Amino acid sequence: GCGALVWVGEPVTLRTAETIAGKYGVWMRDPKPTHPYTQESTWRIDTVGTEIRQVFEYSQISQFEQGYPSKVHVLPRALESTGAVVYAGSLYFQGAESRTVVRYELDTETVKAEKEIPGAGYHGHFPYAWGGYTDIDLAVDESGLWVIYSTEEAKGAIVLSKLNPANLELERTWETNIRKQSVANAFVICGILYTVSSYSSAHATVNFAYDTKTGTSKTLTIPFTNRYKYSSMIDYNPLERKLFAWDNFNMVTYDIKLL
């Protein structure tokens, strides 16, 4: 059952990248797995380099922990930053030097939809506090697919849109009063957008919650540990009820509890 976030566990490290190209990246499982994948299927994308086009796939968690992909997908265009998600058999990612979200069906290796996110800043315009090109952050929660961004119209405040997963049409949009560049990262749980205060502190907090049901925000002080002091990616998986994160070469999870 859904509820507000009340607790975040301490990070558990599943894999440590062995090259500097893995200092930051995105890794994830599918909260709505579809044949031929399972809830154990894992994807991993190192994103420090240029021309990021290869997506590593692991059919078993033990393969992921040992660093041995079972498949490698080649994307037809390059991918930007750490914000991508997998949902219902597709990778949703941002095209390099663009504000375009691309739907890449993993089993057929085909692009099924593209969508320019209207007004979205990109390429270091509205990054998170972590910097880089973290302007556009996709998210999956219990009700489906979302994208987190900002616009000049919103003057840098986080904008949140719900997306049709088949054709990437924007179904609804909310404008917060939370400055995107002031928070380390963000994610959605049960229709509530949460932000993290710091990418480096061992005593950070989940520090804001914006509820889409009310269109209002509140402060929070839920403790959050950046164990390795450089978190580039923090997302939520509603099937596992865990945060998945990338922190200074380490692919980690945080258990969460809801009220």
Chain residues that interact with K ion, rule: CB under 5 A: 81, 132-133
Residue 108: CB partners within 8 Å, gap ≥ 6?
none
* Pick from 159, 92, 91: nearest CA to 125: 159
Candidates 135, 235, 238, 250: give the one binding Ca ion (CB under 5 A): 235
The item of Na ion, Ca ion, K ion, none sharing an interface with residue 127, based on CB under 5 to 8 Å by kind, is none
Picked from Na ion, Ca ion, K ion, none, the partner binding residue 37 (CB below 5 to 8 A depending on kind) is none
**Contact track, Na ion, 198-237, x by CB under 5 A:** -------------------------------------x--
- CA 132 – CA 74 distance, rounded (Å): 23
For residues 139-161, b (16+ Cβ closer than 10 Å) or e, as one string?
bbbbebbbbbbbbeebebbbbbb
Strand order in the sheet with 42-46: 25-28, 42-46, 52-58, 71-79
Q: Which does 138 bind (CB under 5 to 8 A by kind): K ion, Na ion, Ca ion, none?
A: Na ion
- Minimum distance, C-beta of residue 234 to Ca ion, in the bound complex (Å): 5
Judged by CB under 5 A, the residue of 87, 133, 146, 187 near Ca ion is: 187
What is the CB-side half-sphere exposure of residue 93 using CA atoms within 13 A? Answer: 30
Do 169 and 115 contact (CB within 8 A), yes or no?
yes
- Closer by beta carbon to K ion, 41 or else 248: 248
Site track for Na ion across 234-253, x = CB under 5 A: -x------------------
Residue 58 or 122 with smaller CB distance to K ion: 122
Measured from the CB atom, the residue of 141 and 235 that comes closer to Na ion is 235
Residue 250 among known ligand-binding residues: no
Residues within window 65-84 making contact with Na ion, judged by CB under 5 A: 83
> Is 255 within any annotated ligand binding site?
no
Compute the Cα dihedral for 11, 72, 41, 112 and give only its sign: positive
- Secondary structure string (H, E, C) spanning 200-253: CCCCEEEEEEEECCCCEEEEEEEEECCCCCCEEEEEEECCCCEEEEEECCEEEE
> What does the binding site for Ca ion look like in residue numbers (CB under 5 A)?
137, 185, 187, 235
* Residues found near Na ion in the complex (CB under 5 A): 83, 137-138, 235
